[PDB]
């Protein structure tokens, strides 16, 4: 979807061409055609994304970008670290509501040079604003008792003042009635002048979700989870011809109960993780020659509650970062770089940086080469648990990438290989009951993307091979897929819009949870068709149908956990 705009690379708006690292972009239009009913269901489609889940919607899940650990992808919401990742240290989007997602910018490779901790594999920025005047009413009924009801509007309140609102209700079985998402959202956006502007927002969701728990006679059974999250923010932006600045504060508060319905919620049996993220960002950017220079600051405070994340006491983590961005096109060469210093409450400082140049050696064809370093801070339990060690270092990553992209014969494509040597990986020790920094991984992987037109017929193919390994035992990291093939097929024929979306998931090794001492078993490499259509019954009303898992061809991503089979979704939406 190239030469259309992004903000995720350097924080400010820039043509995707100018971004040397590979970026996929998903739109609200794309999501609607896929009829995706969760955020995982969207990411899963995109190059180098390998997702695991303990069942269906709402259930615990982990993203592995380009072989890296679950904790190695940085997931931002509107360019701020996802609050539901604070406690655990790793990103779980299964609880995050798809109703909110309005665009996805996803830039692979490192970017701690811009964003701070966790940006090792890549960066997934979920954007919850878009500019689409009007108002839309939607619903859907589906397999496993899926029902959805959605309203959403954007209006000029003042013609220099915009309001936006959505409300979403989302229920589905699997548990008992186990996953209930209720989202409300509201934003107000004003233009002081053609270039000065400011916004305020609030959203929140309340989620109930049921799950499979481990049973201990005499002791409560915690198989219900109530999450309440909410998020506020406010900002100024300056959008000038030459200078740009944005100043953005955010607050996020979430309570996560895990309890037993018979015993309470506010009962010692219940666990409760209450987290408050505060963030202040000041980004700035000037145009210099054929490019720009940027310089920002981001401050982050996370406070927790006694008991949260399995830690006795409540902590107050803080991180101040300052970074620099650079861009200059000269001739047919292109040059990005970045550099950041973070100051972390617990571990003091760690600088990070990246650079990359490309070269349009022929017109239309480009070779890009890239190098960068990136890191993951240690997390709450790691530092302050019983297994804790409060003097841990960041996990560190050195990253290397080669690429050739071309435009030939009406076909946009890329072949790329990348090296990724992570170090200091924070690892449990059975013997000492503690965490320590020794630990290492070699990741060599390839990425081929392409996409093209034939007839009234549009394809988005791609291919990944990744081979992740401990750099000591030289053996696979469990649970990754040696390769995936991701393919999309789009025609609107006789006004029927169609979509055939197909994925061969490769082979993956997990632990067999069933016979101690647990061995390994190979999981079948399987193929996964989906079919999707949509019809305008009117210039305001579309009906959308779908079948996921067309061939009922069931299997798993976490050994021992059932994955929804053939499932049908009949949906409708009404715009005006």
């Amino acid at each position: 979807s190239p030469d259309t705009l992004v903000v995720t690379a350097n924080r400010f708006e820039q043509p995707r061409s100018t971004v040397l690292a590979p970026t996929t972009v998903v739109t609200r239009q794309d999501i609607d055609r896929w009829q995706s009913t969760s955020v995982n269901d969207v990411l899963r489609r995109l190059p180098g994304v390998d997702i695991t889940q303990n069942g269906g919607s709402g259930q615990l899940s982990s993203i592995f970008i380009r072989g890296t650990n679950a904790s190695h992808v940085l997931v931002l919401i509107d360019g701020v670290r996802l609050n539901l990742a604070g406690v655990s240290g790793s990103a779980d989007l299964s609880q995050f509501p798809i109703a909110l997602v309005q665009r996805v910018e996803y830039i692979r490779g490192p970017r701690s040079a811009v964003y701070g901790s966790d940006a090792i594999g890549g960066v997934v920025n979920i954007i919850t604003t878009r500019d689409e005047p009007g108002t839309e009413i939607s619903a859907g009924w589906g397999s496993n008792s899926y029902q959805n009801y959605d309203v959403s509007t954007q209006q000029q309140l003042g013609d220099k003042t915009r309001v936006t609102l959505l409300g979403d209700y989302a229920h589905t079985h699997g548990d008992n009635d186990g996953f209930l998402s209720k989202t409300l959202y509201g934003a107000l956006e004003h233009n002081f002048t053609d270039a000065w502007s400011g916004f305020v927002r609030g959203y929140g969701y309340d989620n109930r979700t049921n799950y499979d728990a481990y049973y201990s006679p005499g002791s409560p059974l915690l198989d219900t989870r109530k999450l309440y999250s909410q998020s506020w923010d406010a900002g100024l932006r300056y959008n000038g011809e030459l200078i740009k600045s944005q100043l953005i504060t955010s607050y996020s508060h979430s309570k996560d109960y895990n309890y037993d319905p018979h015993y309470g919620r506010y009962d010692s049996s219940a666990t409760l993780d209450e987290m408050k993220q505060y963030t202040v960002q000041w980004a700035n950017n000037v145009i210099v020659g054929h490019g720009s220079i940027g310089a920002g600051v981001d401050w982050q405070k996370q406070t927790t509650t006694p008991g949260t994340g399995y830690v006795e006491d409540g902590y107050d983590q803080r991180n101040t970062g300052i970074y620099l961005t650079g861009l200059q096109q000269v001739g047919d060469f292109t040059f990005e770089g970045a550099a950041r210093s973070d100051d972390n409450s617990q571990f003091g400082r760690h600088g990070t940086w990246q650079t990359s140049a490309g070269w349009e050696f022929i017109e239309g064809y480009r070779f890009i080469a890239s190098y960068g370093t990136s890191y993951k801070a240690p997390n709450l339990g790691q530092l302050y648990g019983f297994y804790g060690n409060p003097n841990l270092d960041p996990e560190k990553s050195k990253q290397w990438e080669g690429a050739f992209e071309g435009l030939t014969a009406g076909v946009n494509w890329r072949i790329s290989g990348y090296r990724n040597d992570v170090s200091d990986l924070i690892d449990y020790d059975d013997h000492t009951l503690k965490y320590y920094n020794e630990g290492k991984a070699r990741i060599k992987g390839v990425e081929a993307t392409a996409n093209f037109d034939t007839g009234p017929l549009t394809h988005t193919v791609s291919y990944d091979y990744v081979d992740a390994r401990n750099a000591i035992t030289d053996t696979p990291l469990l649970r990754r897929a040696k390769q995936q093939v991701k393919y999309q097929l789009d025609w609107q024929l006789y006004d029927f819009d169609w979509g055939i979306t197909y994925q061969y998931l490769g082979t993956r090794y997990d632990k067999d949870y069933s016979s101690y001492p647990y061995q390994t078993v190979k999981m079948g490499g399987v193929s996964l068709w989906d079919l999707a259509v949509a019809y305008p019954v009117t210039s305001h009303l579309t009906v959308r149908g779908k079948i996921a898992n067309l061939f009922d061809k069931d299997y798993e991503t976490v050994y021992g956990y059932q994955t929804a089979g053939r499932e049908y979704t009949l949906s409708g939406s009404y715009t005006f």
Partner: protein, 116 residues
């Protein structure tokens, strides 16, 4: 001679205060060792529990894995209870030793002053 029968009359009164000050320090001492040997066992409980679901530790999707985190939280709450209770038994064992030696040399003085 009666300058000295007040130095036994007050010496006997010194072993009286040091006997009560030893009996108070034995009740405080036995109380502490008690709360401690108890809390040390709610700890060792936690630590075996840890080693039970230790097999799930490097595998966060596992669900017995949660049983291992819960185990440590209750061990760390137990460990801070062992440290509170040991500090207090160290405070009681310093004042049993000090009161045993205070009594014991108040008796040596008392025995010298009994010498008519």
């Amino acid at each position: 001679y009666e300058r000295a029968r007040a130095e036994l009359n007050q010496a006997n009164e010194d072993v009286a205060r040091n006997q009560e000050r030893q009996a108070k320090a034995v009740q405080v001492y036995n109380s502490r060792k008690s709360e401690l040997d108890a809390a040390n066992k709610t700890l060792a409980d936690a630590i075996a529990e840890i080693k039970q679901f230790n097999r799930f530790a490097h595998d966060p999707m596992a669900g017995g894995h949660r049983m291992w985190q819960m185990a440590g939280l209750k061990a760390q709450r137990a460990q801070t209870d062992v440290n509170n209770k040991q500090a207090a038994f160290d405070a009681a064992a310093k004042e049993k030793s000090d009161a045993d030696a205070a009594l014991s040399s108040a008796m040596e003085s008392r025995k010298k002053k009994e010498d008519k």
